[PDB]
Every structure is written in structure tokens, then in C-alpha cells.
Amino acid sequence: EGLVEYIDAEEEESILIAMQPEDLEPAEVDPAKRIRVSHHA
Amino acid sequence: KAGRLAEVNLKDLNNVKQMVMAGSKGSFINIAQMSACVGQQSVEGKRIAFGFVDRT
Amino acid sequence: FIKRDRMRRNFLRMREYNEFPLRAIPKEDLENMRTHLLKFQSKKKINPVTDFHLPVRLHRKRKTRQLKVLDENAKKLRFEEFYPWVMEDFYNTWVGSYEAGNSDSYVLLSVEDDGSFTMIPADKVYKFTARNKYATLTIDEAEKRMDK
Amino acid sequence: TTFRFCRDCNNMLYPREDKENNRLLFECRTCSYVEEAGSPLVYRHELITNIGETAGVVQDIGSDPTLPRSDRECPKCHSRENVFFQSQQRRKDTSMVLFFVCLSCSHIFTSDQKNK
Ligand SMILES: [Zn+2]
Ligand SMILES: [Zn+2]
């Protein structure tokens, strides 16, 4: 269904992976939580 | 700079402070990395190279 | 903060034009005639041999029992003609060369006397190259010169 | 620079000095074709270069996902959608200036201040 792809290590050169869906797809905090960076990409 | 900020705020209770002070085990870098920040990883004296094409 | 393996409760309790007919062209011709292709690679805008010369000439220029290698016929055939196709006067010149890149997916519809066409796939395709336009060579001396 | 080839020979034309008419001609050490010198300059060596700073900027550079976008406005397009990248001269001494490319006019500009 075209939901998940295999990606080798060469092809990996030409994609831009998100790290986790939520924290990264929607566009736009606990101090104990670690510090992350944005979906600027 | 962040390490000194943590070390300073530890009170004499703080058990790892009491092991640094006794010279017994551990040191500043250790407490700095546990509580404050881990700082710059590095490979051959240089920051992480561009293993992928132009990105890390 | 925990791992909840009882979720299998909820997930269990939630769910103009020129049209031309083409026919079974005679084969005996093709049984003796082989229709190849040819390309000149001199950029010479037209380069038709109409202006080449006359006459034109296109042609090519004890032990006991043993086991030999095995090989299919076509390669055995194709190999067994290492004489290339040539054109000359008796002095402008060209030399042929097998191409083999696209020998297959090319059937031909030559504009015959009429617009129609018998059906003809190309046998082979040849790359024809000029030669001796300046006709210099030190075939023997080349090694001598390239080692001065 | 700007090599010249023969025709009906197609090799490359070395320069053969005409002294008598006193100018430069290009021979062809295989077929005797000749012609003039369209310019008296013959050769360049180019130690310190400034090319490849835009290597392979194709009309698709806008279609490469991995390239970082940026917002600055093109001097021409005044559109504010542009990809960018460092100078493609993969050499150590190379500067770190940025070449932008507006997705609209495909105009190339630079982040420079020392020299635009
Ligand atoms: Zn020539
Ligand atoms: Zn623009």
C-alpha cells in the first residue's frame, strides 16, 4: 500500500528523514524533559 | 561554564560532592556530564564529519 | 511510565494521411538477402556514396580425442566473421563495424515504389567510419617514435 | 583555453606561427587544415579559481529535498523561497560563502558581503 519503504544505505543519501512523526510533522515544556530541536525542516 | 554552575549549587549533603571532595572517586567532568551537559562529541579532535554527503 | 500489556482489553472491547497495408513479404529473398543497417560517423552533412567514387565495392577485408569449449551458434557465427565491411574506389574509404546495441527492436518500412511497405526487421546495424582521409601512419615506427 | 578542432580531420588545432603575414594560425598536425587566431591569447593556467561555486545548478536544484531552504528574497524575483548551499569547490582553502538559488527565477545570488 505504499506505506513503508525499504531504504538501503546509498539511497539514504537522498532522503530527509523525520525523527518521530508527532514531534516533527505538524508545524507550529517540562524542564525535566530532555531538550530537542524543531521541525524547521 | 555549565559544569561550574552545577558543582556550585551542590550542597555538602550531595553525596557525589562528598566523594569529589574526599578525592576518593570522580571529578568535575564527571559531575558536569551527569548533571549539566555532555558537551561536544568528537572524533579525531574534530567534530563529527560529514559521513553522508554534506550532512552528518 | 509503565508498559501496559492489558491494552488487548480495549482493542478487544473496542472492536490527410497515407495508410498502407503490409503483408507476408517473400522469404526466399530474405533467405538469401540480409538487410542490414549502416551509419557514417563523419558528420559529413549528407555523405552519400553517390558522390563517393566509381566503382563502389562493399565487401570484407598427433592428438587423441579432445573436448572443446561450448558456445551458441550466433556468437560462433558472429565471431567467425572478423573481416569488416569496406567501401573504396580501386581513394576515399570507409570501414564497417558491428553495433549490436539495438539490433532487435527495429523493423523497417522503406518507402518502396509505392507508399506501402513490405515488412522488414533489420538484420544487423553497422557503424561505418572513414579512413585515410590524411592516410598517415608509422605502424612500425610508432613504437620507435613513442620511445625516443 | 577554448580549444579548436579541425573539420574533415576533427583533431585539435595546435597554433602554428605565421611570421610572414605575422600573426598566429592554427595548424592541424594530422590534416593540413589551417585558420587564423581568433585571439592572440593562447594559454591560461588559473591557479586560484572561482568556478564550480555553482556546480551542476540544474533547473531541479529546487526539487532536492535535502537541501536547506531559506527565506531571503532574490534581488530579481523578490520572491522569498530559495534553496542554498556552500560553494561546491570541494577543496580545503575554500571559503564558506553561501550560494542561494531562488525557486522562481532560478537566479543565483550569494550571501556575501566582501564582494557581490
Ligand atoms: Zn584536420
Ligand atoms: Zn529570484
Helix residue ranges per DSSP H, chain D: none
Element (H, E) at C144: helix C141-145
* Chain B residues near residue A12 by CB distance under 8 angstroms: 52
Are residues D37 and D55 in contact, defined by beta-carbon separation less than 8 angstroms? Answer: no
Are residues B49 and B43 in contact, defined by beta-carbon separation less than 8 angstroms? Answer: yes
Q: What is the CATH number of the domain that holds D28?
A: 2.20.25.10
**Residues recorded for chain C:** 148
Sheet holding C94-95, edge to edge: C39-40, C127-130, C94-95, C85-87, C59-60
Pair (D57, D82) in one structural domain: yes
Pair (D38, D61) in one structural domain: no
What DSSP state is assigned to residue B54?
T
Q: Dmax over Cα atoms in chain A, in whole Å?
A: 41
Resolution in A: 3.0
Q: What is the distance between the alpha carbons of residues C91 and C131, in angstroms, rounded to a whole number? A: 10
Touching check for B53 and chain A: CB below 8 Å?
yes
Pair (D51, D3) in one structural domain: no
Total domains in the fold of chain D: 2
Pair (D56, D87) in one structural domain: yes
- How far is ligand 1, taken at its centre, from the CA of residue D18, in Å? 18
- Return the C-alpha torsion angle C49, C55, C59, C60, nearest 10: -100
Question: Solving technique for this entry?
Answer: cryo-EM
Cβ within 8 Å of residue D56, ≥6 positions away:
D88
* Chain C residues near residue D9 by CB distance under 8 angstroms: 133-134
Pair (D12, D64) in one structural domain: no
Pair (D70, D41) in one structural domain: no
Q: What is the distance between the alpha carbons of residues C58 and D43, in angstroms, rounded to a whole number? A: 46
Pair (D50, D67) in one structural domain: yes
Pair (D37, D1) in one structural domain: yes
Pair (D58, D105) in one structural domain: yes
**Which residues in chain D belong to E strands, given as ranges?**
15-18, 23-26, 69-70, 82-86, 98-102, 108-110
Pair (D6, D62) in one structural domain: no
Pair (D68, D27) in one structural domain: no
Nearest CB among C43, C44, C134 relative to D31 is that of C134
Pair (D24, D61) in one structural domain: no
Are residues D101 and D107 in contact, defined by beta-carbon separation less than 8 angstroms? Answer: yes
The boundaries of the domain holding residue D29 are 1-45
Element (H, E) at C7: helix C7-14
**Which residues in chain C belong to E strands, given as ranges?**
39-40, 59-60, 85-87, 94-95, 107-108, 120-121, 127-130
Cβ burial B32-54 (10 Å sphere, 16+ → b, else e)? beebbeeeeeeeeeeeeeeeeee
